[PDB]
Amino acid sequence: MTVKKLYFIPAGRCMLDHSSVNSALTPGKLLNLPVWCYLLETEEGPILVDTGMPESAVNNEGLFNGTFVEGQILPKMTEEDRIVNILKRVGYEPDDLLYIISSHLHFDHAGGNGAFTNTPIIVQRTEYEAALHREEYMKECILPHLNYKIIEGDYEVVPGVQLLYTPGHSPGHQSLFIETEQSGSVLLTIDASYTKENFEDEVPFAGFDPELALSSIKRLKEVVKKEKPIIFFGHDIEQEKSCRVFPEYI
């Protein structure tokens, strides 16, 4: 069985130093990177992958002033980029969603999680437990009373929607392998590779455990050899130019 439609939905942007996309680069040039969420229309109902940035980021590029990442990360988020507003424009309210899938709990991927207080939020155990104590996690991304559906390892959410455990960039990062009616096999690496060169050329990039990130890239490459999917990376300015985005779908 296949997903009916896979939508790429812009959810604001984020400035990062270029050394975060290629660890060999000299710090000092910021890159204005895309932030994405994905909407899957399935037989069982709509599924949202990631939830954008927290409300604290709205019109607040200096959000991380005074923290260990001051000047390194600057969110570019307007009121329109709040996930609830994105969803309402698309045609949904939070309680309409079948599942939320959190690729991981970094601030640009889980900042909107608090909006979903009934929908099960599928997240890896190792990610959830990291978010409880590691300093790179915002409180907005680990709210205590949401309906978490904690999983361990690879997982089938519904037919056509597979989660691949790809730790390294974060302790419980997961990627998506989706089968769509229009396109067949699609791999969303999410932050298992920010850019094409992180994936193809194994160019190192920001992560909790680069050695583990590399092993997850090698694992994805084995999947790619078998399945020959179309592949989309987490924060790739070049690829963004050619991506079909909402209202188009793949």
Ligand X SMILES: CCCCCC(=O)N[C@@H](CCO)C(=O)O
207 binds, options Zn ion, ligand X, none, Cβ within 5 to 8 A by partner type: ligand X
Beta bridge partners of 10: 36
Residue placing its CB nearer to ligand X in the complex, 16 or 188: 16
Q: Contacting Zn ion (CB under 5 A), which of 17, 140, 191, 236?
A: 191
Which C-beta is closer to ligand X: that of 69 or that of 158? 69
Residues that bind ligand X (CB under 6 A): 14, 16, 33, 73, 106-109, 136, 169-170, 191, 206-208, 235
Out of 106, 124, 174, 187, which residue is the one contacting Zn ion (CB under 5 A)?
106
CB of 90 to ligand X, least distance (A): 22
Q: How many residues does the chain have?
A: 250
- Binding part of the chain for Zn ion, among 71-79, 106-114, 179-187, 239-247 by CB under 5 A, reads 106-114
**Does a cis peptide bond (omega within 30 degrees of 0) precede residue 94?**
no
The smaller minimum CB distance to ligand X, of residues 170 and 216, is found at 170
Q: Which does 12 bind (CB under 5 to 8 A by kind): ligand X, Zn ion, none?
A: none
Binding mask 211-240 for Zn ion (x = CB under 5 A): -----------------------x------
| Euclidean distance between CA atoms 106 and 98, whole angstroms | 22
14 binds, among Zn ion, ligand X, none (CB under 5 to 8 A by kind): ligand X
* Nearer Cβ to ligand X (14/231): 14
